């Protein structure tokens, strides 16, 4: 293994001769101290290296060692439950081993535990022809998730020796006969974070994700393989929404990525996330989460690589046949790292100092998400769903980062602190929000429920949009100038906001609403509407309809709290509506 020598040091930029055995983008251990650097350029045998940690105290003469690879992740058992930085340093191993609260220059630690014994259960048989993504056996890594060991990309051939037993992730568990002879496989593979893990095919992300959060699942849904953006205004309950999706969604794993956050904000996530309880098991959510945590203090390259490191891990589990959600907060800070990196490379800036390639990088990320047929003879499916927070200074959505994002994703959940001000939660602005998946989801939904769901959703939304119109008429001038049909409309609208859109995350039952419960609840809201219309045309007046329906609207208000094993007491409200309204027709 060949060793360069530093010939120049000037700020973050180091140059070393005798590097010809290395490659553009290789990661480096620079100097005596051995700090992390990336080769940016090569002229003959001279490498220019962008160094990620302070170069203070380094000068000509000292060694440089190429790692032999671009920035990569270790992928194998031990990865679930960890907290990493943007470049996969293990933040807990860091504390035990260095006995320190500080991240010291050029301390190197493997991302995963290489010493831990795991039980490997072999599922494949000797003689079997295999290639990238075939499953050879599995590890029960956590109480929840089964880690499937796949044949790495690049390998093809015949299983020669496989066997169950206790192994560390370094031990050869399997030998493949290839055309180049015998290759040993371990339970781990490395992958470069800027290269998307290959797939058999990309599919349309057409299955709706069940978040159990009524405003999302119903009016602004995201499909498994879709992507949503969320603005991040202070005081609008973003964290609580993030948590609800992280824990209620019907995905197998969450990858959470914190890009380059304020120290104390990042500390918050680090504390709160481990306390999320997994709904089906009672175990920590961490038993199926991988967290990346970066403070704005971290190296710019770790802040920049955060999302890639994130997505690559998500891809690895996708390949196993799983549904993964990747949560990036906030991609605005990620982009700030991009901007810095651009200035460091003495580049031409684009708009507002952002590199010319901002949009590209965003696209590259989002297009690495989606529903796919993974490699392997199984042709199994998996998917990655992106939920990305944005936090444009002062809230301004019209800036570069949010603009380019809405140019490539399909769902926008617009959190709004004025809704928060009004105690309306989740503070998703139902006028400004959208989901370009609504139609396709409507179709699935109508099919799976045997019901006119699309119709109900669009009626619901038509009612809310009517309310925006009416509201302006009332403000200027007169609530007592509106027809009975409009006063009725306002009450149905109020019922959609208060009884449906408003969900309390901290309540046993309201915390999560099933697809079937969502349907009965909206069916009862809309049929109060329909029965009252019928009664109004039959010559009953508004005030009288209100007056005589106190009890039954109360039942509508408490719908959200009916347990799932009792959806009959929701259906039955329809009978109570009809019977009450028809009675009033006299």
């Amino acid at each position: 293994m060949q060793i360069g020598k530093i010939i120049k040091v000037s700020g973050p930029l180091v140059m070393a001769e005798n590097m010809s055995e290395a490659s553009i983008q290789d990661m480096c251990l620079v100097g005596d101290l051995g700090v992390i650097g990336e080769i940016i350029e090569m002229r003959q045998d001279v490498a220019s290296i962008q160094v990620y940690e302070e170069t203070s105290g380094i000068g000509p003469g000292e060694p440089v060692r190429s790692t032999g690879e671009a920035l990569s992740v270790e992928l194998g058992p031990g990865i679930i439950s960890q907290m990493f930085d943007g470049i996969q340093r293990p933040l807990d191993t860091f504390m035990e081993v260095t006995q320190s609260n500080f991240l010291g220059r050029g301390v190197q630690l493997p991302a995963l535990d290489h010493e831990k014994q795991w039980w490997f259960e072999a599922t494949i048989e000797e003689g079997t022809e295999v290639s990238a993504g075939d499953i050879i056996g599995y590890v029960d890594e956590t109480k929840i998730i089964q880690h499937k060991i796949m044949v790495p990309n690049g390998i093809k051939g015949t299983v020669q020796k496989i066997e169950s037993g206790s192994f560390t992730i370094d031990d050869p568990i399997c030998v493949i006969e290839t055309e180049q002879g015998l290759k040993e496989l371990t339970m781990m593979q490395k992958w470069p974070v800027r290269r998307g893990r290959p797939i058999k095919q990309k599919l349309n992300p057409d299955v709706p994700m069940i978040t159990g959060q009524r405003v999302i699942d119903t009016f602004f849904p995201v499909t498994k393989g879709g992507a949503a953006a969320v603005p991040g205004p202070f005081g609008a309950g973003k964290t609580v929404v993030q948590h609800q999706i992280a824990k209620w969604s019907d995905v197998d794993l969450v990858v959470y990525v914190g890009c380059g956050e304020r120290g104390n904000e990042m500390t918050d996530v680090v504390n709160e996330f481990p306390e999320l309880i997994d709904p089906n098991t009672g175990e920590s959510l961490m038993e199926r989460t991988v967290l990346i945590a970066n403070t704005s203090n971290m190296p710019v390259a770790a802040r920049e690589a955060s999302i890639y490191t994130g997505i690559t891990i998500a891809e690895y589990f996708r390949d196993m046949g799983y549904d993964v959600a990747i949560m990036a907060d906030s991609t605005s800070r990620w982009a700030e790292a991009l901007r810095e990196m651009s200035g460091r490379l003495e580049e031409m800036p684009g708009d507002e100092g952002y590199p010319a390639y901002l949009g590209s990088r965003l696209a590259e990320y989002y297009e690495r998400s989606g529903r796919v047929i993974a490699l392997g003879s199984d042709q199994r499916e998996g998917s990655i769903t992106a939920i990305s927070a944005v936090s444009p200074s002062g809230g301004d959505i019209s800036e570069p980062v949010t603009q380019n994002t809405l140019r490539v994703v399909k769902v926008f959940w617009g959190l709004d602190s004025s809704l928060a001000q009004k105690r309306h939660f989740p503070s998703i602005n139902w006028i400004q929000s959208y989901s370009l998946y609504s139609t396709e989801v409507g179709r699935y939904m109508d099919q799976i429920l045997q019901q006119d769901w699309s119709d109900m959703v669009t009626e619901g939304m038509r009612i809310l949009q009517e309310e925006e119109q009416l509201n302006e008429i009332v403000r200027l001038v007169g609530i007592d100038s509106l027809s009975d049909n409009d006063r009725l409309t306002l009450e149905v609208a109020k019922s959609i906001r208060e009884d449906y859109l408003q969900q309390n995350a901290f309540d046993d039952v309201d915390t999560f609403t099933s697809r079937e419960k969502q349907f009965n609840m909206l069916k009862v809201i809309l049929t109060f509407g329909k029965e009252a219309r019928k009664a109004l045309s039959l010559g009953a007046y508004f005030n009288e309809i209100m007056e005589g329906t106190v009890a039954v609207r109360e039942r509508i208000s408490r719908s959200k709290y009916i347990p799932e094993e009792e959806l009959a007491k929701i259906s039955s409200i329809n009978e109570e509506i009809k019977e009450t309204i028809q009675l009033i027709v006299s």
């Binding site: 055995e21 350029e41 003959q44 390639y357 590209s360 696209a363 297009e367």
Partner: protein
């Protein structure tokens, strides 16, 4: 086919090869990486025995000493054939559809050739788009360039697919083909196009060039040039009337801007290179007709407008090269108007040479201007009429604004799956006008037929 194993420098996505010979400016290259990977590139500069190349897929992972460069001896070319019809390609014209072939007749520079000014013929005859607000008030002629100006969140994608399906020449005896260039769009956007085109069988007469958002910038920049080169072949060697549709031209300019920055150029006006005007002119001038030839090329560049600003480099510069423009607005779109065409700021500079008796029908010119003026005063009859509301409604001015209401919802709001023959368009033209008294009017011989 030269191969050199003598790479001297890599800086970002640029490499210097040395001890090279017979290499030409802009020649395509292949980099054979030490690990077996192959990347395409282009020679940016050639000096003595050196060549500087740009690698499309970038230069990450490359080990200089063990990589090699094949110099191919030609620039970016398209391999043309009649078998392009019904096939899908990417931005460099590689098959994307898993189909068979194709063995090209020949290879052409995607830059093309500049037409001798005496050889060019003036744009001539009606193309039917099936879209009233274009076919009537903003008519499209064979050989024209009429862009769609738009904006993020706008259904210009949907409009694009519709014209592609509904564009026809009625009648003629000459073939009619569509080249469709998608530039930097998402996989889902693409899948939507390939899905619609096949559902309706528009594919059977379309050639499709699909450039994705995550494709390298150089492929974005090349995509329309591949498309126009296919267009011109079909038009000028096969005698077809060819309609070229490209979305989204805004994506294209970002890509220029991205290449310009990589190549260490000083930016021009508002971020973009001075030569954005020139570059675009290279594209839009590639439309028209040739004296002595039957075929034509017609262009509908589609673009989204940043900040929704018409004076921005991108639409502005497009403006001076093209011949009118179809605007789409948010006010109309939000009213569920499909397509949301605002006809007032919309214009076709060439209508006159593609309408009237023989081309469309005798009443075209007049009905257009009558429907237009009536929509003009009708909208003013509401702009100042929300100021002073309907507490008192005018008898003439409130029969005008009802026209301004119905125009949008019945005449323009036709639907994205609705092909309206010109015959139909004009019949609905008059049907709406009969809301006004005769004294508010085309001419005396109106009620004639």
């Amino acid at each position: 086919i030269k191969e050199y194993r003598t790479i001297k420098e890599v800086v970002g996505p640029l490499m210097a090869v040395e001890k090279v010979s017979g290499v030409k400016y802009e020649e395509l290259i292949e980099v054979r990486m030490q690990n077996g990977e192959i990347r395409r590139g282009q020679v940016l500069e050639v000096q003595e025995d050196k060549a500087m190349v740009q690698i499309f897929e970038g230069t990450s992972g490359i080990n200089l000493k063990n990589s090699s460069v094949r110099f191919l001896g030609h620039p970016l070319q398209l391999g043309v054939s009649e078998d392009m019809i019904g096939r899908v390609f990417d931005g460099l014209g590689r098959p994307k559809d898993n189909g068979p072939e194709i063995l090209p007749e020949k290879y052409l520079d995607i830059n093309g050739e500049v037409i001798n000014p005496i050889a060019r013929d003036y744009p001539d005859e009606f193309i039917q788009t099936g879209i009233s607000a274009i076919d009537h008030l903003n008519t499209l002629v064979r050989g024209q360039k009429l862009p769609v100006f738009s904006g993020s969140g706008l259904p210009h994608k949907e409009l694009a697919a519709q014209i592609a399906r509904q564009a026809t020449v009625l009648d003629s005896s000459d073939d009619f083909a569509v080249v469709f260039a998608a530039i930097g769009i998402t996989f889902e956007e693409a899948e939507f196009f390939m899905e619609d085109f096949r559902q309706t069988g528009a594919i059977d007469r379309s050639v499709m060039f699909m450039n994705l958002a995550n494709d390298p910038a150089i492929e974005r920049i090349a995509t329309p040039r591949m498309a126009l080169t296919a267009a011109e072949y079909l038009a000028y060697e096969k005698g077809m009337h060819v309609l070229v549709i490209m979305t989204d031209m805004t994506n294209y300019a970002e890509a220029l801007r991205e290449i310009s920055a990589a190549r260490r150029e000083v930016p021009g006006r508002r971020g973009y290179p001075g030569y954005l005007y020139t570059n675009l002119a290279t594209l839009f001038e590639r439309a028209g007709r040739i004296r002595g030839l039957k075929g034509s090329v017609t262009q509908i560049p589609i673009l989204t407008m940043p900040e929704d600003d018409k004076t921005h480099p991108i639409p502005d510069l497009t403006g001076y090269i093209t011949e009118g423009q179809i605007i789409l607005t948010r006010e109309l779109y939000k009213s569920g108007i499909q397509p949301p065409i605002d006809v007032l700021p919309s214009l076709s500079r060439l209508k006159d040479k593609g309408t009237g008796a023989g081309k469309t029908r005798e009443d075209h010119a007049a009905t257009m201007n009558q429907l237009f003026a009536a929509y003009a005063q009708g909208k003013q009859a509401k702009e100042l009429a929300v100021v002073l509301g309907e507490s008192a409604l005018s008898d003439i001015d409130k029969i005008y604004a009802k026209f301004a209401e119905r125009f949008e919802n019945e005449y323009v709001n036709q639907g994205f799956y609705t092909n309206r023959t010109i015959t139909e368009t004009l019949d609905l033209g008059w049907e709406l006008l009969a809301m006004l008294p005769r004294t508010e009017l085309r001419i005396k011989d109106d009620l004639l037929d």
